[PDB]
Structure 1
């Protein structure tokens, strides 16, 4: 399950990091997000949802 939960959740992780980096570019365009995201603990929930889904799918067989 560890490989699958990593492969399926990969697009959402890249989307989130792309959103964060473009937000940082917009912020700097007027003229640190690592701490913000590391405190948001997003990736954890994104991985947890997929892990729960895959465990539920694998439980039946």
Structure 2
């Protein structure tokens, strides 16, 4: 019974990490374009 509980309580932290990676990925994408390409 612990797998569902640990996948449900640890959802906000994973979502926050995903948000941070989305921001850090769009910044890197904007640097990648315009630099040489």
Q: Name the TM-score, length of structure 1 as normaliser.
A: 0.47
The structure carrying a bigger helix percent of its residues is: 1
Instruction: Using CA pairs under 8 Å that are at least 6 residues apart, name the structure with larger relative contact order, 1 or 2.
Output: 1
CA deviation profile, 1:7-45 (whole Å, cap 9, x unmatched) = 0000000110111111000111222xxxxxxxxxxxxxx
Runs ≥4 residues deviating over 6 A: none
**Highest Rg: 1 or 2?**
2
CA RMSD of aligned residues (A): 0.8
The count of aligned residue pairs is 31
Unaligned ranges ≥5, structure 2: none
